[PDB]
Swiss-Prot record, chain A:
Entry binding sites for ATP: G87, T88, N89, S157, K158, G399, D486, K491
Organism for this UniProt entry: Homo sapiens
Name the UniProt record assigns to this protein: T-complex protein 1 subunit theta
Complex formation: Component of the chaperonin-containing T-complex (TRiC), a hexadecamer composed of two identical back-to-back stacked rings enclosing a protein folding chamber. Each ring is made up of eight different subunits: TCP1/CCT1, CCT2, CCT3, CCT4, CCT5, CCT6A/CCT6, CCT7, CCT8. Interacts with PACRG. Interacts with DNAAF4. Interacts with synaptic plasticity regulator PANTS.
Primary residence: cytoplasm
Chain residues that bind ADP: Y34, G35, G87, T88, N89, F90, M156, S157, K158, G399, D486
UniProt binding sites for Mg(2+): D86
Gene Ontology annotations of biological process type: binding of sperm to zona pellucida; chaperone mediated protein folding independent of cofactor; chaperone-mediated protein folding; positive regulation of protein localization to Cajal body; positive regulation of telomerase RNA localization to Cajal body; positive regulation of telomere maintenance via telomerase; protein folding; protein stabilization
Swiss-Prot record, chain B:
Modified residues (N6-acetyllysine): K210
Disease implication from the record: Neurodevelopmental disorder with speech or visual impairment and brain hypomyelination: An autosomal dominant disorder characterized by global developmental delay, impaired intellectual development, poor or absent speech, and brain abnormalities including hypomyelination, cerebellar atrophy, and optic nerve atrophy. Some patients have severe visual impairment, dystonic movements, and seizures.
Residues bearing the modification Phosphotyrosine: Y235
Modified positions (Phosphothreonine) in chain numbering: T418, T447
Family note: Belongs to the TCP-1 chaperonin family.
UniProt superkingdom: Eukaryota
Record's protein name: T-complex protein 1 subunit gamma
Cysteines joined through disulfide linkages: C354-C360
Protein's cellular compartments: Cytoplasm
Binding site for Mg(2+): D81
Record's catalysed reaction(s): ATP + H2O = ADP + phosphate + H(+)
Keywords in alphabetical order: Acetylation, ATP-binding, Chaperone, Cytoplasm, Disease variant, Disulfide bond, Hydrolase, Intellectual disability, Isopeptide bond, Nucleotide-binding, Phosphoprotein, Ubl conjugation
Curated annotation (Swiss-Prot), chain C:
Subunit structure, interactors included: Component of the chaperonin-containing T-complex (TRiC), a hexadecamer composed of two identical back-to-back stacked rings enclosing a protein folding chamber. Each ring is made up of eight different subunits: TCP1/CCT1, CCT2, CCT3, CCT4, CCT5, CCT6A/CCT6, CCT7, CCT8. Interacts with PACRG. Interacts with GBA1. Interacts with DLEC1.
One Pfam family here: Cpn60_TCP1
Positions that bind ADP: G37, G89, T90, T91, S92, S158, K159, G412, E505
Disease implicated: Intellectual developmental disorder with polymicrogyria and seizures: An autosomal dominant neurologic disorder characterized by a broad phenotypic spectrum. Main clinical features are developmental delay of varying severity, intellectual disability, seizures, and polymicrogyria. Additional variable features are non-specific pyramidal or cerebellar signs, and visual impairment.
Lineage start: Eukaryota, Metazoa, Chordata, Craniata, Vertebrata
Binding site for Mg(2+): D88
Organism of derivation: Homo sapiens
PANTHER family, per database record: CHAPERONIN
Designated gene of the protein: TCP1
Record's protein name: T-complex protein 1 subunit alpha
Length: 510, 513, 534
């Protein structure tokens, strides 16, 4: 501080200033997101797919900043996504809007040893009565609209219009094939990207769905010993053309000899490894192809790690290079294996159905990934929100319809308590409007208009805005009795977690 | 010419110069007080309790630096207090509400907000305004000694409590309305150079420095008669307009004495007729006026008909064209008391006059020349309560607490009011609580948590009655503590402050012309 | 400016002096937009570092403004000359006047020949002329539920401070109908100029006391002559009695003070002799316009007298006209021996004076030359009456503006924003350059409400949402009725169903601005040969 030396990225002014500033400015995404929005972010991690996103996690994945809080705080926001898929586009803006509320009190000179407490105290008071404002619950998880209702806040939060069929599709996916007894799996039920068809045509094909081509035959038996090999067939010794015509009529044969009789013993020992399906991370040679069909081994011409990973995951596989007679440490998991036409594409389908280890797989059909990923993003954050492992989601008013409910809870409780925390608690009664504004922003009105008319509804529970004409002038969309609902789980987290972030980030001076 | 300035930027220009004035004299305000230093470009020391005094003496900006003088001069004309309070409320509130509200995009509901945060303000003020009795100079004391200490004077306060508290009761508008609330004509503040607190007598009537200036002028005829011209004098103080030419040197002098000779021949007629008093409203110069001293007469000169005719009713005189002419007494005796208390040989006529139109000049004597103006401002700060208490026995104990009573109860009505209305309502209601907490600053300790508890105390126990004082910075009953906030004051200090608010909120452009 | 800066004087050489004019037209219009009407915010107009003024008036700023641009030149006069027309359209012309000269010359230059485009900004205005004159639809005060009473009320209830529209639903009726006078504009109209209305201080914060006949302003304590005798007749006097000076002057030419008082004292007694003749003729009360000084008061106090003096001539004028009396039928002299006449007797059932609030008026009951009423506004202070009276005058005026015209148009741009898409589709009707020509104006009937409700911060795109909710293919209709509400009430920012409120304007004030709208456009065209002067 008074030294030429030592270190800091934070402190003094900065702690009061820079640590609050950009952490807020992060919220611009979540300021436009979480709840129905057409507003999106083109995020180019340079993939040659230029990625539309409102999802904070993969917005913040690129974002890097010297502000130690904003450096850190994305942790709690990403620690959130781990715990709930939805509510994450809520996390960053709420505290971010709740932050400079304290900084204004810092301009008033209300201490860091003071203000955040009242937040934390009203963070209690929230999570105290936050379970009281729980209303519904998602009970039968085989049921569509108990699942698709939770989904109907969550995908909605990420993205608006596509949500409805997705919610159906995701509930029609029956992520309840996992009994949700404490069981859920992100790889077993997986997204499978299919270029073309519709995204309304995007389906759930149970099993493991590989848009990669099943080559030659299908499995000998449906309980396969699944040969998942990074390079089982790279070719053994390749043919050549020398003269821009032929090299030599004589030199042609000996390389097929090495190719064939190796890939003979190769695929014969792909048969002697007992592989019913050989799953090739690399290419296939037509000789091994011929061998894969004679030796009766389902062949997959090419495999992305997307296959190989889930293969290693599900099958117990290890994707292996082979120029040699193999052995299966992969074996199978699967009770069924197929070439099915899904996306109306010939698809490598590994399959079985159980409660546990069961692969029941989303198949997304879309012209691009930016279609099939951000929507998947929108999708899976409901699938993620489906993951509670308390089967009843304890559905609160969705669409953030509990804002106005807790808002008058906290502001009345901020009236009760004396001392500077009464402000902080009343300041905690404030940042509610962020998403109602974030809605009203992408909807196009100020939360004041919204929230004051929803200060007129007082205790309501149902009405809260979104992206819609109802969210502009009427200040009302019915987000409790809706079809649009959200679990108490992410309610337990985001209010606390975004606080857990905001706790010490003003305290950190160095 | 062709120029356009815009809205919130002009509103900010209205914010800027005012926001500076909102600070020092706010610190100078109340029991926790300061001074505003003014650096002259040559270095001369200037410090006052009034920043507008500092503004008049330095650069004043065309924005509210000009206006916060104006509307405080507007505040200075009316109750003669709160100018210090108006500057610090207006620019503050304009600095407070606008940004929060204009980012919500409206002056519009803010247009309604100031009079709504005025509404409950005016409302519960009068409701918690505690009756303080007019008949008692002691039960007018705690309020008027509070008012004269709003500018931090207990010095001549109690003495202004003596003279003025019954004096505004003796102030009568001759419309026979109030009376009780009195503009300054029928009640004036006029002083005698030097003197002493007993050379200060309670003086409830007009005081003519010109009634008796000299001893050869009238001496204690307890009911004089003020003669205006018309017979004893005439309507000519003239010039014979003698022809002139270069060859006549004596001709320049005759036209010079001719103005005096007609002034003389009227006073010569006064020498002939010999009243006790003549009022010459055209005025008489030194020459002919020295001739009225041998006739046993005072010469009252170059005063006004209004004052004279009131003086007539005030001192027991009346307008009659001659002393030998005797028609009737409109006032046989119109005086409560007749005094002349001289400083030096120059005489000063004190005529104490009860419920006359008069001037109600309230004799105000500093111990010497200099603090006379103190006693003037104090007897002026006196008559503020004196016209407030006599009008309104109700006046709020407070001004630390009344400022709290207003603020906390205002947004407390947003709990009742709500709507989109609440947001500009509270925002124009936000800045008020800070005024005591601005003074609780110089109480040391925590200026915030005190008022915080006091803000709780506001609706908890009581508001302006039992509340924060600038002397305490903490809860005391402002009645039991004797700190009083005149009801007429709060109805104004905020008003003219919120008057300049909506205006400077609504003035969105300054053209080159 | 813009373009070549080396040739001064509105040679920017090409549209540079057209655009610098239209961008100035837009700029000079930027002054008045946020100034438009009362919702248009008062500007604080710097006249100098030490000189300012605060006005939202459209014609007040621009008279103060300097304009060396030709299009800025035509805009100031249009604000002023339409103010010179009415005062409705100080603000109104300014907004589109920026547009139409910007809208005119563009196609005029395109010429198949410039004559074609000129009507496009006249034609739609002409088609607005009919539509505007086709409006009885809103602003009609004569057609109420209570008629004049609600025409009072709704116009009072527009400016309402209070119970305005309760007792004041009566008064604007009472005020216009207490007036028998020859001022007439077009169809028969009754002056709100001649209304005798005075202020009360105390008693009711808001009440209107309705008294028969004219009530003459008077006060006690300023006259030592007792002025009060109950009678049926008054003497209205243009005349004076003063003991100081009545026929008397001063002498600076005379040295002797004896000369002044000798001719002075004669005039003092003849005042007491003249009061006897004015009284004893017919009149126990005698109403005198000429006054007495506070000094002269003493002379009339201690020498005694009778008369009612220092009374407003405007009333004593109106009273004698109302009460059948005469203001001066007799005196060619001020003499005391000059007899008084019985024609100056007020013809009245009684001469009575109600002092109330500590405010006294001389009530002339049953004025027999014509009916009258002097309505006493009850405030607790006198400025409460102005809030009433300001609510009254415009209520008086708007009814008088409905006394100006039967056909009357709604305040606010629901009149315009209707024809807007009506006539901007009528652009397409003729098509060609006229679809350009007609739209340029008919796109601009959208913009006035975009200024109007936004001055109320209503985001008039929400208003035009409500406006063109009324404005339909099914409702193209000014009619005289509303199957669409064509009213836009500018005390709000959104339409209200008041057609009797004081904000609305007659058809007289509008078709005027229609010329003014098109006036900034082609006025600047007729020039030829842009040049440079050394």
């Amino acid at each position: 501080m008074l030294k030429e030396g030592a270190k800091h990225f934070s402190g003094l002014e900065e702690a009061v200033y820079r640590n609050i500033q950009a952490c807020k400015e992060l919220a611009q995404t979540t300021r436009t997101a979480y709840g129905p929005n057409g507003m999106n972010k083109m995020v180019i991690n340079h993939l040659e797919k230029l990625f539309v996103t409102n999802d904070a996690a993969t917005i913040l994945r690129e974002l890097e900043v010297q502000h130690p809080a904003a450096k850190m705080i994305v942790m709690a926001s990403h620690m959130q996504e781990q715990e709930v898929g939805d509510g994450t586009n809520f996390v960053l803006v709420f505290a971010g809007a709740l932050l400079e509320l304290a900084e204004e009190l810092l301009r008033i000179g209300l201490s860091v040893s003071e203000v955040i407490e009242g937040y934390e105290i009203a963070c209690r008071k929230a999570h105290e009565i936050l379970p009281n404002l729980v209303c519904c619950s998602a009970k039968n998880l085989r049921d569509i609209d108990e699942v698709s209702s939770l989904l109907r806040t969550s995908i909605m939060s990420k993205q608006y219009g596509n949500e409805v069929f997705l919610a159906k599709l995701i509930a029609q996916a029956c992520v309840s094939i996992f009994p949700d007894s404490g069981h859920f799996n992100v790889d077993n039920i997986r997204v499978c990207k299919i270029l073309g068809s519709g995204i309304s045509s995007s389906s759930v094909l149970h099993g493991m769905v590989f848009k990669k081509e099943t080559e030659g035959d299908v499995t000998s038996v449906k309980d396969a010993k699944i040969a998942v090999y990074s390079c089982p067939f790279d070719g053994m010794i390749t043919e050549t053309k020398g003269t821009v015509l032929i090299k030599t009529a004589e030199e042609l044969m000996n390389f097929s000899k090495g190719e064939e009789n190796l890939m003979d013993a190769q695929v014969k020992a792909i048969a002697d490894t007992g592989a019913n399906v050989v799953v090739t991370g690399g290419k296939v040679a037509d000789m091994a192809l011929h061998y894969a069909n004679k030796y009766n081994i389902m062949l997959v011409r090419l495999n992305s790690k997307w296959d190989l990973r889930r293969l290693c995951k599900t099958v117990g596989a290890t994707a292996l290079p082979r120029l040699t007679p193999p052995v299966l440490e992969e074996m199978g998991h699967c009770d069924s294996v197929y070439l099915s036409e899904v996306g109306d594409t010939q698809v490598v389908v590994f399959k079985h159905e159980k409660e546990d280890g069961a692969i029941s797989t989303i198949v997304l059909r879309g012209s691009t990934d930016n279609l099939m990923d951000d929507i998947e993003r929108a999708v899976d954050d409901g699938v993620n929100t489906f993951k509670v492992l308390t089967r009843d989601k304890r559905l609160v008013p969705g669409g953030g319809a509990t804002e106005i409910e807790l808002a008058k809870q906290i502001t009345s409780y901020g009236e009760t308590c004396p001392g500077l925390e009464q402000y902080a608690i009343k300041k905690f009664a404030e940042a509610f409007e962020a998403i109602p504004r974030a809605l009203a922003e992408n909807s196009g009105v100020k939360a004041n208009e919204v929230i004051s008319k929803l200060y007129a509804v007082h205790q309501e529970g149902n009405k809260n805005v979104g992206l819609d004409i109802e969210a502009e002038v009427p200040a009302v969309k019915d987000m409790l009795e809706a079809g649009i609902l959200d679990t108490y789980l992410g309610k337990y987290w985001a209010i606390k977690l975004a606080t857990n972030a905001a706790v010490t980030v003003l305290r950190v001076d160095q | 010419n062709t120029k356009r300035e815009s809205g919130r930027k002009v509103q900010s220009g209205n914010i800027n110069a005012a926001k500076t004035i909102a600070d020092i004299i706010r610190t100078c305000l109340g029991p926790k007080s300061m001074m505003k230093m003014l650096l002259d470009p040559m270095g001369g020391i200037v410090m006052t309790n009034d920043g507008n005094a500092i503004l008049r003496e330095i650069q004043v900006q065309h924005p509210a630096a000009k206006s916060m003088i104006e509307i405080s001069r507007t505040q200075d004309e009316e109750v003669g207090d709160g100018t210090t309070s108006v500057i610090i409320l207006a620019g503050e509130m304009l600095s407070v509400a606008e940004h929060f509200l204009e980012q919500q995009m409206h002056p519009t509901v803010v247009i309604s907000a100031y009079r709504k945060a005025l509404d409950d303000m005016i409302s519960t003020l009068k409701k918690i305004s505690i009756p303080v009795d007019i008949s008692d100079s002691d039960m007018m004391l705690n309020i008027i000694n509070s008012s004269i200490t709003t500018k931090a004077i207990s010095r001549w306060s109690s003495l202004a409590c003596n003279i003025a508290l019954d004096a505004v009761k003796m102030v009568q508008f001759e419309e026979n309305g109030r009376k009780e609330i009195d503009i300054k004509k029928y009640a004036r503040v006029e002083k005698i150079p030097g003197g002493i607190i007993e050379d200060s007598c309670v003086l409830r009537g007009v005081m003519i420095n010109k009634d008796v200036t000299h001893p050869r002028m009238r001496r204690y005829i307890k009911n004089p008669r003020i003669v205006l011209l018309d017979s004893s004098l005439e309507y000519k103080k003239g010039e014979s307009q003698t022809d002139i030419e270069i060859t006549r040197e004596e001709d320049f002098t005759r036209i010079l004495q001719m103005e005096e000779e007609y002034i003389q021949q009227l006073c010569e007629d006064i020498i002939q007729l010999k009243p006790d008093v003549v009022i010459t409203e055209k005025g008489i110069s030194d020459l002919a006026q020295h001739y009225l001293m041998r006739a046993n007469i005072t010469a009252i000169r170059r005063v006004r008909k209004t004052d004279n005719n009131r003086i007539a009713r005030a001192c027991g005189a009346r307008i009659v064209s001659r002393p030998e002419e005797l028609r009737e007494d409109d006032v046989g005796t119109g005086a409560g008391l007749l005094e002349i208390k001289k400083i030096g040989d120059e005489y000063f006529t004190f005529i104490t006059d009860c419920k006359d139109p008069k001037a109600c000049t309230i004799l105000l004597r500093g111990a010497s020349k200099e603090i006379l103006s103190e006693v003037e401002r104090n007897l002026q700060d006196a008559m503020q309560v004196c016209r407030n208490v006599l009008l309104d026995p109700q006046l709020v104990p407070g001004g630390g607490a009344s400022e709290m009573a207003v603020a906390h109860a205002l947004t407390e009505k947003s709990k009742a009011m709500t709507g989109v209305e609440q947001w500009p309502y509270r925002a124009v209601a936000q800045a008020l609580e800070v005024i005591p907490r601005t003074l609780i600053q110089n109480c040391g300790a925590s200026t915030i948590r005190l008022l915080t508890s006091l803000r709780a105390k506001h609706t908890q126990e009581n508001c302006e009655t039992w509340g924060v004082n600038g002397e305490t910075g903490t809860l005391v009953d402002m009645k039991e503590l004797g700190i009083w906030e005149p009801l007429a004051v709060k109805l104004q200090t905020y008003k003219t402050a919120v008057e300049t608010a909506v205006l400077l909120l609504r003035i969105d452009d300054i053209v080159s012309g | 400016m813009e373009g070549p800066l080396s040739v001064f004087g509105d040679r920017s050489t090409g549209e540079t002096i057209r655009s610098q004019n239209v961008m100035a037209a837009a700029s000079i219009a930027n002054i008045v937009k946020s100034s438009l009407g009362p919702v248009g915010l008062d500007k604080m107009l710097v006249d100098d570092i030490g000189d300012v003024t605060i006005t939202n008036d459209g014609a007040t700023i621009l008279k103060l403004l300097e304009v060396e641009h030709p299009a800025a030149k035509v805009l100031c006069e249009l604000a002023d000359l339409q103010d010179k027309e009415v005062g409705d359209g100080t603000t109104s012309v300014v907004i589109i006047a920026a547009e139409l000269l910007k809208n005119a010359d563009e196609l005029v230059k395109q010429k198949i020949h410039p004559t074609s485009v000129i009507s496009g900004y006249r034609l739609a205005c002409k088609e607005a002329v009919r539509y505007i004159n086709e409006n009885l639809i809103v602003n009609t005060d004569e057609l109420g539920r209570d008629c004049l009473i609600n025409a009072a009320k709704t116009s009072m209830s527009s400016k309402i401070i209070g119970i305005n529209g309760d007792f004041f639903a009566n008064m604007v009726v009472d005020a216009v109908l207490a007036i028998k006078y020859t001022d007439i504009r077009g169809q028969p109209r009754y002056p709100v100029n001649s209304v005798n209305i005075l202020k009360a201080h105390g008693r009711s914060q808001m009440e209107s006391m309705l008294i028969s006949g004219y009530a003459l302003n008077c006060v006690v304590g300023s006259q030592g002559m007792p002025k009060r005798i109950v009678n049926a007749k008054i003497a209205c006097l243009d005349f004076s009695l003063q003991k100081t000076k009545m026929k008397l002057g001063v002498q600076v030419v005379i040295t002797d003070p004896e000369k002044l008082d000798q001719i002075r004292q004669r005039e003092s007694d003849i005042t007491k002799e003249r009061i006897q003749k004015i009284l004893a003729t017919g009149a126990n009360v005698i109403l005198t316009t000429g006054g007495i000084d506070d000094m002269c008061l003493k002379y009339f106090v201690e020498a005694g007298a009778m008369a009612v003096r220092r009374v407003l001539k405007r009333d004593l004028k109106r009273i004698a006209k109302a009460s059948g009396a005469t203001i001066l039928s007799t005196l060619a002299n001020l003499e005391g021996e000059e007899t008084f006449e019985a024609a100056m007797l007020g013809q009245a059932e009684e001469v009575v004076q109600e002092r109330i609030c500590d405010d006294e008026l001389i009530l002339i009951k049953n004025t027999k030359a014509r009916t009258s009423a002097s309505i006493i506004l009850r405030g607790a202070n006198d400025f409460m009456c102005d809030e009433m009276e300001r609510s009254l005058h415009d209520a008086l005026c708007v009814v008088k503006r409905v006394l100006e015209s039967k056909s009357v148009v709604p305040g606010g741009g629901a009149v315009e924003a209707a024809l807007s898409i009506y006539l901007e589709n009528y652009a397409t009707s003729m098509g060609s350059r006229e679809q350009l020509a007609i739209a340029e104006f008919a796109r601009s009937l959208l913009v006035i409400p975009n200024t109007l409700a936004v001055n109320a911060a209503q985001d008039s795109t929400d208003l035009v949402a409500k406006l063109r909710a009324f404005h339909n293919e099914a409702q193209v209709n000014p009619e005289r009725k509303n199957l669409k509400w064509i009213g836009l009430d500018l005390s709000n920012g959104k339409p209200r169903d008041n057609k009797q409120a004081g904000v609305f304007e007659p058809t007289i004030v509008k078709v005027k601005s229609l010329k003014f709208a098109t006036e900034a456009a082609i006025t600047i065209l007729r020039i030829d040969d842009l040049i440079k002067l050394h």
